[PDB]
Amino acid sequence: GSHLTPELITSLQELSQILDRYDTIVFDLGDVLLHWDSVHFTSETKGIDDVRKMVKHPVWQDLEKGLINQEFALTALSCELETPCSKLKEMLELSIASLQVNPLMVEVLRVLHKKDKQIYCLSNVDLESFSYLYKQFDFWKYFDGIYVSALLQLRKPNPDIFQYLISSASINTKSTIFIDDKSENLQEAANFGISTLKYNKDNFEYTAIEGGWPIPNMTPEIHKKRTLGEDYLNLRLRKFPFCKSFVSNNVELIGGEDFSKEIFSTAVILHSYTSLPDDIIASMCHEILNHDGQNKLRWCFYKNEARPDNFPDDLNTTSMVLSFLLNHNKLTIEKIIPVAEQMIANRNEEGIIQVYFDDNRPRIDAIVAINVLYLMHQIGYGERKELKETEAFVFDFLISKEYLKGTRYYPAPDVFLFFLSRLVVDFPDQFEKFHKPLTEMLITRVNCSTFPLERALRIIALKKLGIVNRVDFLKLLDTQLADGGWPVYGLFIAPRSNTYFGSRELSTAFALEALHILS
Amino acid sequence: TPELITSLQELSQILDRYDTIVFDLGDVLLHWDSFTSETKGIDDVRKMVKHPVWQDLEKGLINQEFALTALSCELETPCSKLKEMLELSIASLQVNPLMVEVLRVLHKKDKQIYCLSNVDLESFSYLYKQFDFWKYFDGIYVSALLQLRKPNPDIFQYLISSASINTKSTIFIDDKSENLQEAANFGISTLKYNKDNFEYTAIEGGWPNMTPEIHKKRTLGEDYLNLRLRKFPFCKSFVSNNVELIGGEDFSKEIFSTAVILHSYTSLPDDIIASMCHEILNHDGQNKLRWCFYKNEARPDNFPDDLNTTSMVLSFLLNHNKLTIEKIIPVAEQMIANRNEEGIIQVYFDDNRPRIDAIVAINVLYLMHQIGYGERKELKETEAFVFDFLISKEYLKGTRYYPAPDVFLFFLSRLVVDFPDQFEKFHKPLTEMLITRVNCSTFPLERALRIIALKKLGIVNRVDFLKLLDTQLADGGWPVYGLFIAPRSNTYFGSRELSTAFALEALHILS
Ligand SMILES: [Cl-]
Ligand SMILES: [Cl-]
Ligand SMILES: [Cl-]
Ligand SMILES: [Cl-]
Ligand SMILES: [Cl-]
Ligand SMILES: [Cl-]
Ligand SMILES: [Cl-]
Ligand SMILES: [Cl-]
Ligand SMILES: [Cl-]
Ligand SMILES: [Cl-]
Ligand SMILES: [Cl-]
Ligand SMILES: [Cl-]
Ligand SMILES: [Cl-]
Ligand SMILES: [Cl-]
Ligand SMILES: [Cl-]
Incomplete structure (x- = not known):
């Protein structure tokens, strides 16, 4: 068996020792720092009932990258998912309104901030959701930099988003660990030499990544x-x-003197x-x-x-x-x-x-x-x-x-x-x-x-x-x-x-x- | 080394040998006669057309209002004076009566004929309205519509690919050497137009963007x-009640x-x-x-x-x-x-x-x-x-x-x-x-x-x-x-x- 073997972590004391070894920690938002309820039947029976059908549709990627806004995305999805747009909107608002912090993980973030780690947020979020989340929650102050797909025109798991973060923030990948629940994000980050920490329901999977090889934009x-x-x-x-x-009499100063x-x-x-x-x-x-x-x-x-x-x-x-x-x-x-x-x-x-x-x-x-x-x-x-x-x-x-x-x-x-x-x-x-x-x-x-x-x-x-x-x-x-x-x-x-x-x-x-x- | 040509009869035999002919507009089909001014700033339009901002205008990235505004700053000339000069230049353009007839004859002989030219969109719109040789072209390739410009090789590749041109039987008539030089690199034969003669280079083509x-x-x-x-x-x-059907059922x-x-x-x-x-x-x-x-x-x-x-x-x-x-x-x-x-x-x-x-x-x-x-x-x-x-x-x-x-x-x-x-x-x-x-x-x-x-x-x-x-x-x-x-x-x-x-x-x- 050549596959690397993740060290299973099941005690906060273990998690604290591992995380203490690294200078830089990168957090995802979704299902690391936040959770939400996606199921919402409404007063309208026609169409889908689970907001997961929207966020996994290819059009959602255009929303996440800031190419389109929410009105636009829901118009396209009401067609593709055969669901009235006003129901899609209601489902999405209720899901958004039901989001809460992950109490353990927000506390983790607060402690890493106290220990003067470098902490970055790297997440796929559309622009209007990000606005809302920024106002609603109060862990943003723990971040040294915030890298959100809708401000980047990039999205996980595209390698380019990892490359841009590493370059933008001058990250030394050797002392960087990345916390995420999706295996394909973690694999993309390990291939940049970042160590990985898979956030599961009842455990953490810890993979130290020696790395060392060099990094592959505008x-x-x-x-x-x-x-x-x-x-x-x-x-x-x-x-x-x-x-x-x-x-002149116009903002472009056309014909100005x-x-x-x-x-x-x-x-x-x-x-x-x-x-x-x-x-x-x-x-x-x-x-x-x-x-x-x-x-x-x-x-x-x-x-x-x-x-x-x-x-x-x-x-x-x-x-x-x-x-x-x-x-x-x-x-x-x-x-x-x-x-x-x-x-x-x-x-x-x-x-x-x-x-x-x-x-x-x-x-x-x-x-x-x-x-x-x-x-x-x-x-x-x-x-x-x-x-x-x-x-x-x-x-x-x-x-x-x-x-x-x-x-x-x-x-x-x-x-x-x-x-x-x-x-x-x-x-x-x-x-x-x-x-x-x-x-x-x-x-x-x-x-x-x-x-x-x-x-x-x-x-x-x-x-x-x-x-x-x-x-x-x-x-x-x-x-x-x-x-x-x-x-x-x-x-x-x-x-x-x-x-x-x-x-x-x-x-x-x-x-x-x-x-x-x-x- | 080019072959100097001064016989119309010869020219007609050189051109009859090609299936596809590419014309430029400048000097080849339109030429001008250049009216003073004591106002401050530049006197000849030559300084606008050689300024780097002119390239943005030719590529269709900006319009004339925009380019004149920037040029009025870089050339320290009132934009209204630049605008008047630009307009008088463009309106003093006249057809080249020999080349227009060469073009009419080639069209009536069933050649494939293209126009490949650096011109900004609004000038092109005016020249398209002003003159009546456009009907002899099979395809018009204008820089402001392409977002490409001569002499970058991208525009020649685009033309060859877009019109499915076999370079073996294609000749390019132009009066700038660098444009012809670039065309030759793609296997295209060149006919440099001077006022006294044509320089003709035969070039063996036929060998194979986004x-x-x-x-x-x-x-x-x-x-x-x-x-x-x-x-x-x-x-x-x-x-719905709007063209984007936001809210549509x-x-x-x-x-x-x-x-x-x-x-x-x-x-x-x-x-x-x-x-x-x-x-x-x-x-x-x-x-x-x-x-x-x-x-x-x-x-x-x-x-x-x-x-x-x-x-x-x-x-x-x-x-x-x-x-x-x-x-x-x-x-x-x-x-x-x-x-x-x-x-x-x-x-x-x-x-x-x-x-x-x-x-x-x-x-x-x-x-x-x-x-x-x-x-x-x-x-x-x-x-x-x-x-x-x-x-x-x-x-x-x-x-x-x-x-x-x-x-x-x-x-x-x-x-x-x-x-x-x-x-x-x-x-x-x-x-x-x-x-x-x-x-x-x-x-x-x-x-x-x-x-x-x-x-x-x-x-x-x-x-x-x-x-x-x-x-x-x-x-x-x-x-x-x-x-x-x-x-x-x-x-x-x-x-x-x-x-x-x-x-x-x-x-x-x-x-
Ligand atoms: Cl049907
Ligand atoms: Cl909360
Ligand atoms: Cl905050
Ligand atoms: Cl203060
Ligand atoms: Cl003082
Ligand atoms: Cl992407
Ligand atoms: Cl006031
Ligand atoms: Cl005020
Ligand atoms: Cl000064
Ligand atoms: Cl015409
Ligand atoms: Cl008819
Ligand atoms: Cl019939
Ligand atoms: Cl260029
Ligand atoms: Cl009517
Ligand atoms: Cl009507």
Whole structure:
């Protein structure tokens, strides 16, 4: 008998010794951390009765990979399974509503987290189910990274999903064990050198895997597109370190004209793309410091030559600039704190910090509130009680889903979620209640629009929150133009004239950040 | 080392030696005469066409608005100035009168003749409308429709495979050396066009992309469709209030879907054709060779026989030798007795339910020409109805029973291509419309219609075909699609069978 022989495990003490030997543990969700009831007769007798007929149908694979959504999958299945779609939907909702944790295995996960193991979730789940599961259960915080088929356009047991996890997370397979109930997933993982642990009803099957042989994707294309985009952006900003911009009446800036007389794009690029060459940072920083419309560490959007009559300094440009200058050691907190105090003196009747340093131009904007809050927490103002109404404004904007209508100056919903994730992730103790609702919204928006900049925002925000969004990443590659830059995009607007501002530089900087953060 | 040629008589003997001739458009068939500007930015269009972004535009990845927007940034020229220059360039193009005559003669001598050219979609649409040599090509291979461009060897392989070219007897006329160089690598002889002469290289051919995956998907699709129709030869249908039939309920009580499939997908196995033909012949909604859309069990009270089901059924049976023209002609005469006061043939056999529909008129006209009624004078107004519907672009509003514009263009293409002498004036306006619509909607059945109709008109639409491939589900079927509606209640009918049958016809016709 040449077949390897799994060591049977029947005592939690044994399980703990085995698991303690490994640096990295990979969990499945289904029937390891969760269980559910699949049988649901309804008020409708026609058709199937067991949700297992749906999840094992080939169409379910398209759902799992994010190619189709649940409405679409159920339409196809109502035909193939000769069952009214409204019954299929009812069956699926009831099954989903009946899911619970596996108490032993969630406790296992919590303990491995305490012991500072590296823990990853690798699972086939469709996108809307994943959203729901993320909100409903509370073991996600135990994971160092979450790899879900609907965000990957891959599914177990395809070898490519194991290869992508191993590469994405830099896994050393020799000290990695994989817990799953399906034998064909475990066999696929062992052939990558990962040791296996079969989760059975009353036992565990433990197979140590010496491994050692090397590992068999998109990676060559990726390196050339990254290089081509870098070269494109570096040439643009070495030639024009004052970031150019075009104005038009549509988000694609079709027929836009060169404007190039506002400092905010430059600040945005400094603030967001973390791999700029040092010489470009210096030249762009110089444009910030020497900008026309700086008055006593307050910044105006416009160069003086372009400033409309009576156009005030604004808190969005000032917050983002002060925050960048402080992070790069060009200003001290003690110089910034008096300007922050003027921001706190800029609240309106509801207590919300406003957009302009000008009592005759009252406005609020939830992204401007976010970036003001970011600066506040950065300088030590984080517990000033005068911030409470501004934070609640931001919180309700998220929870109410009002952000789906955009803000006054930023129409795209993902921009709000993106700048929010900077605050929620960089100051986690002060923003815990934002973490899950924010991550849940982002999950539901994976691949929901085609604009490269929007794609890139979702990639970066989700990855900073522990979740790998490979789908938006792939489609982001498809839209690089042949000179290596991405298309222009209108990131913000003058709302009364409906003028969009944007640049190829802005799109390309975020696209490269997204490519970098998943590398 | 090329052989320099300056004798027309020689050229004629070189060209007579080849079965297959490939033309480029630039310099070979169209040349230009280059009007200044003191505005800021570039003066010659040469800088746009050599910019890497121009390649995206030629490959059909972006349109002209998009490319001009990027180019206006990289070239620091106002996009409106780039746009004006582009347009003046394209409109100053003129035919090459010698080559157009060479091409007319080769066509009249029965050669196989192809156009292989890098041109963006909107320019091609304009040039297709502007000039009248397109009719001498057997197949037009344009980069914006292929998502390939010269001189990459992929585009030559695609052409050789797509048109089944024997390179031994093929010669390529072009004026760029790198294009000819690449063609030679495939065994194709070259004729470099200069203004004073041709350089001719004879090259010995005759020696032997995504074909692996295409085959799997075609096999998977055929297996899905064959299983569905072996199990339900009365083609099923679902109904709902939206084109995707989200929320749709099984209906399967109308015969027209079965007729559409028999009529449109030409590779069904013999046994499925027989069972489905049996459903047509046994349909109880039938009365003296007129058909009703509904089974009797579902017929609404006083619902009449209609010319759309009847025309399509009679046409299919005549074509599959189940009925004779002599039995059909008295039904055709009843259709001619069904004109409204404007002289247009109506939808229903019932003077109390007066309706017209441009697709019903098309399928009636098709039957008429098939049976020898093609010159009856009573058809004149119905034909003018269809023509005005096309030319006026009113078809973009859909017809009464078919909301999707490509459905009208697709059924028109069958008529126009199957009876080419009676519909000449339709050919170019119809091909123009279809060209501007390449890749303009996501629905698979619509993609498929544009692919099939364009190929029948001699233009290879690979853009729509590649996107078609991505929407197949893992069981081999494409998603359900609402092909027609009961307009007063706004009910869509459709099936996965219909979507799948058309998608497979599209894959087959480009194979
Ligand atoms: Cl639970
Ligand atoms: Cl959690
Ligand atoms: Cl997969
Ligand atoms: Cl500059
Ligand atoms: Cl400090
Ligand atoms: Cl406001
Ligand atoms: Cl707002
Ligand atoms: Cl904190
Ligand atoms: Cl023509
Ligand atoms: Cl190329
Ligand atoms: Cl049947
Ligand atoms: Cl006959
Ligand atoms: Cl009518
Ligand atoms: Cl109509
Ligand atoms: Cl004819």
